[PDB]
Design a protein around this ligand. Sequence first.
Ligand SMILES: NC(=O)c1ccc[n+]([C@@H]2O[C@H](COP(=O)([O-])OP(=O)(O)OC[C@H]3O[C@@H](n4cnc5c(N)ncnc54)[C@H](O)[C@@H]3O)[C@@H](O)[C@H]2O)c1
Ligand SMILES: NC(=O)c1ccc[n+]([C@@H]2O[C@H](COP(=O)([O-])OP(=O)(O)OC[C@H]3O[C@@H](n4cnc5c(N)ncnc54)[C@H](O)[C@@H]3O)[C@@H](O)[C@H]2O)c1
Lengths: 504, 504
Amino acid sequence: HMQFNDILAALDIDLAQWKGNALTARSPLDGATLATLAVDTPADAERKIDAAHDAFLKWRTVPAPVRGELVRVFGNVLREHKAELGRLVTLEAGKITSEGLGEVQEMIDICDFAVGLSRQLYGLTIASERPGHRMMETWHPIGVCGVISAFNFPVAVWAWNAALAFVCGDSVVWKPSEKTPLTAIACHVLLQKALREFEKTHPGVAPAELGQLVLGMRDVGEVLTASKKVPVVSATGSVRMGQEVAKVLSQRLARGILELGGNNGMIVAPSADLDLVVRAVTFAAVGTAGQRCTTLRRLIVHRSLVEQLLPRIEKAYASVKVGNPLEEGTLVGPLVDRASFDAMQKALADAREQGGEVKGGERVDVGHADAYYVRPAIVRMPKQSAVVERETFAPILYVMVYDNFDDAIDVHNAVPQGLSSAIFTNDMREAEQFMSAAGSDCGIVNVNIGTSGAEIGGAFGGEKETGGGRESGSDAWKAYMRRATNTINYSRQLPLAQGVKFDV
Amino acid sequence: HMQFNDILAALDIDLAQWKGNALTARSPLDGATLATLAVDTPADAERKIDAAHDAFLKWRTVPAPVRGELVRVFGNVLREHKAELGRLVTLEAGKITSEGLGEVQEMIDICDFAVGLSRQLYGLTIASERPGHRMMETWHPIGVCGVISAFNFPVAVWAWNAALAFVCGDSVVWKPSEKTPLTAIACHVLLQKALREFEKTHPGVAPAELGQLVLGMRDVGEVLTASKKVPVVSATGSVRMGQEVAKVLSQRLARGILELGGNNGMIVAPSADLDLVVRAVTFAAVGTAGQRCTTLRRLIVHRSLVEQLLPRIEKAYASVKVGNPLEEGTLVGPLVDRASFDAMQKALADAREQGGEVKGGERVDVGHADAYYVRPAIVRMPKQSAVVERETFAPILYVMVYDNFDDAIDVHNAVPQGLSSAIFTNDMREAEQFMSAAGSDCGIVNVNIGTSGAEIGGAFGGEKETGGGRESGSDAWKAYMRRATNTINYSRQLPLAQGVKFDV
Ligand SMILES: NC(=O)c1ccc[n+]([C@@H]2O[C@H](COP(=O)([O-])OP(=O)(O)OC[C@H]3O[C@@H](n4cnc5c(N)ncnc54)[C@H](O)[C@@H]3O)[C@@H](O)[C@H]2O)c1
Ligand SMILES: NC(=O)c1ccc[n+]([C@@H]2O[C@H](COP(=O)([O-])OP(=O)(O)OC[C@H]3O[C@@H](n4cnc5c(N)ncnc54)[C@H](O)[C@@H]3O)[C@@H](O)[C@H]2O)c1
C-alpha cells in the first residue's frame, strides 16, 4: 500500500511543476480528485511541435543502433520504477494491480524489441534491369510522430509508438487522454531520466526535446493533427475520433496509424474444449471491466453446447469479485466515469427492448456516488440486433446461438468493427476456415485463445471501422519511416542521341 | 501506318457497342473527334461495383498461383496486340510511337512480375512467447479495388494496379480519365479475351465480372470513391484530386493508394559527367512533352558548370523535333489540350515576372487550332520562386544555380511535391549524402540516372504532396490485401482460476 504522494515521490515527479487550475485529474476508484493541473495553450502546443521538429533534424542522423541504446536505457528505467508506475495506472485507469504491472511490462518488452529493430530497419537490395546500375530500397526517419492515446491503456500505447519512433529516428509529440494525464507525466519524467543517463555515456547525441508531452483538451489535440510539421499521427480511440483525425490528415496528405474501436467476437464450435472455453470467455469478457479494445463482447455458440456451457459461464460470472482494484481478490474494478456507466445501462435497456435476457449488469455500491462499479453482464440475444453492433465500452457479453458454421462466420463478420476475433474448436478444418480468406475479417484472428490474445512480436490492429493501422510487431515499424527507391548508375555509357545534337 | 478503324478491328473492338452521344473521345494530335461514346450513370456504376464485389467473393478463394495464370495469359494477349494498343496510346495520349509501345510493354512486364508474386504473397511465421502456441501473419484478398487513373499513362497505371490486385484475389473497378476512354475500352476488351482463353483451361474458375470499366465524368468517379464495397482505391492524378479522394476515403475509413503530382529536380554537382548530364537532362525534361509525372522540371546546377553545361542543353533543346508523334523523327508530341497549353503559357509569364529568362516555349503551328504543340522551355531563374514550386504539367525546365551542397539539398527539398529526384556526380560522398536521411526527401532518389529512372521491381510513388502511395515492386502488393495476425493455442493447459469458480 503506497499512497499517492509516495508514488509521485518514488517516480521523482514534482507536482508543483505541473499543478494548475485547468485540468482535474480524477481517480475512477472513488471519484476523488488526485490533482489539478495546468494545460498547454494552442501556442504552447505549436512551440513544442517546433522543438520536436528541431529534435528530429538532429536525431535522424544518429545511427539507429545508437538510437536503440537510448531505448534500452529507457527500458531499464521502466524496470526500476515498474511497481510505482503500475500503481499509478491502477489509480488513474482503474485496472487491478496485476494489470497495472502487466501494462508497464508491455512498455518494457517493446523497448527490448525495439532495441533489436535498431540493428535492422531492413529495406532491400533489388536486381535492376539496367546494365551497370544497382537498385535498392532504403528507409528513412520521417519526422515528428504525433501520438494520440486513449484512457484505458494510458502508458503502453504511447510506449508502443515511442519505442519504435525513437529507434526509427523520429521525435514524438504525445497528447494523452485528458482522462489520464498523471500516467503521461510519469512516463515523460521517466523518459527524461533515461535521457540524463544516456547523456552521460553519449554526450551531445540525443536532443533534449526528443519527446514532448502536450496536456489539454480538444484545442491542442487539433493543433497536433493539423500541424504541417507532423507527417504521421498514431491515433488510438473511438471510431468517431479516428474519422475526424483521418479527415484532417487527408487534407494535408499526411499519414495516419488509426487504432480505433473493436467489437470482438468468439465462435464456439461443437468440438471445443469447454473447460478451456468457460475460462477464456470469462477472462476476456470481464477483464479490465470490459474496457479493453480487444474485450470479448460477442459470443456465437453452437446450439448443441448452450445448455452445457452457458450455466458454467453464468456461474463463473457470479463468482467474479467486483471491487476496489487495490484489494487483493478484486478481478473487476470500476468503469472510468459516469458517461461510461450511463452508456452501459442504456445498452442493456436497448438489449431488453430487442428481445434480450440480461443477467448481471447492476451497479455495485462502494460508497461513492461518482465512482461506477458494475457486475459484468451476459445477455442472451435472439439475434445480433442493433445494440450488439454498437461498441459499448463496458462488460456486456451478447450471446447468439448458431447452427451452421458458414452462418456463424457471417454473424461474426456482420458488425462494422474488425479488431480481434477467435474460434474455439478442436476441428482443424473449422480452425483453418476461420483463419482463411473467407473466414474472420479481423486484424487479429485466433484459435483457442481469446480476443486479447496478442503479443509484442505480432502486428497489432484491425480492419473495417477499426481503421487499418498496425502497431508493435512484424514490420509495423515501416509506418514510422519513409520508403525511398534508389537507382544508381555507375556505368560510363551514354544514352543514344535519338538524332538530338549533343556533340560539342 | 494503321488507320483508326484498323486499330479497332485488330483489337477486336466493336465500337457500335460503346458509341453514344455523351462523351467525346478527342485526339491531341489534331484535335479531331475519334469517336463519341456512351457513359455510365451513377446507378450503372453502382451495379458494376455490386457485380465486382460478387466476383471478389468467388475470386478470393481461388489459389493465388491459379489467379496468376490468368494474369500470365493476359500478358500474352497484350504481347499479341502490342503494336495496335501502343498506336492507340499514341492517338489518345499523344506520345510518340516508341513510348506508346514502351507503355504497353510496362503492362506486359508487370504481368510477368505478378505471376511471380502469385507464388509468394509472403507473410511471416513468428515466434510466440506462449508455450504450446504458434503465431503467424497471413495476408488475404481485401475486396473490390477501385482504380482512378490519369490521361498521360492511360494503360500502364491500370495494369500496375490490376495485375497485382487480380493476383492478390481482388476484383477491379476502373474509372479511367475521361480524356482517354478508348485506350481503357481496349484494355477491357483485351482482358475479356484473356478471360475467354483462361475459361478454356480453367472452366468455372474466374468470375466473368472480375474486371469492371466505368466510363464517365465526376459523378461516377464519386460513386466509386464513396462506395462502402470498395475497401481500397488507387488514385493517380493531381494533388487536388488526391486530397478530395482521401477525404472521402477517410470518412468511411477506407484505404488509399495516392499517386499524385511531382515536381522533380536534379542536382548537378561539380564532378558530374557532363556528356551524360546533357543527355539525361534533355530526355527527362522534354520526353512526353513534359507530361510524365516523373518529368524533370527543376535543375540545380553548380556555379562552376553553368557556362559549360547550359549552352549544351540549349543546343540539344533547339535540335529536338517537335511534331506529330506518328512521324519518324518526332521526339516531342503535343500537349493534351488547350487548358494545358494555357497553363504552360501562364507559368512562363509568371516566370518572367519573377526574374526568369525563358528560351523556347513557343507554340508550333501544325495547322489545327485545337491541337497544341510547343517547343520545350528552359528558364534561367534567379531563385526557386513561386512559379517553380507549382507543378506545371508541360515541358518547362527551371534552372537554379547553387554554390554549397547543403544549400542545393534545401532548394531541392523546398517544393511541396516529393515524387522522384536525382543527383549527377561522381563523388561518392555527395551521392550517398543525397540518398541519406538528410538528403533528397523524395520517394525515388537516383544517382546519375534521371527522374524517370524507375522499373517494375521497385516500389513506385512519392512523399509530401505526392501522397505516399506505392505501386508495382517490392512489397507494394500488400496494399491490395489485408493483414491478419493469427495466434493458435494447441495446448491442453487451462488458465489459472484466479479464484473464479470454474468447477462443474
Ligand atoms: N485499436 C486499438 O489499439 C485501441 C487501443 C485502446 C483503445 N482503443 C479504443 O479506444 C476507445 C476508448 O478510448 P477513449 O474512450 O479514450 O476514446 P476517445 O475517442 O474518446 O479518445 C481517444 C483520444 O483521442 C482524443 N481525441 C478525441 N477526439 C479528437 C479529435 N477530434 N481530434 C483530436 N484528438 C481527439 C482524446 O482526447 C483522447 O486523447 C474504444 O473505442 C476502444 O476500442 C483502441
Ligand atoms: N504519382 C504517379 O504515379 C502519377 C502518375 C501519372 C500521373 N500523375 C499525376 O497526374 C497529373 C496529371 O493527370 P491528370 O491531369 O489526368 O490529373 P487529374 O487529377 O485531373 O485526373 C486524374 C483522374 O482523377 C479523376 N478525378 C478528378 N477529380 C476527382 C474527384 N474529385 N473524385 C474522383 N475522381 C476524380 C479524373 O476523372 C481522372 O480520371 C499530374 O499531377 C501528374 O503528376 C501521377
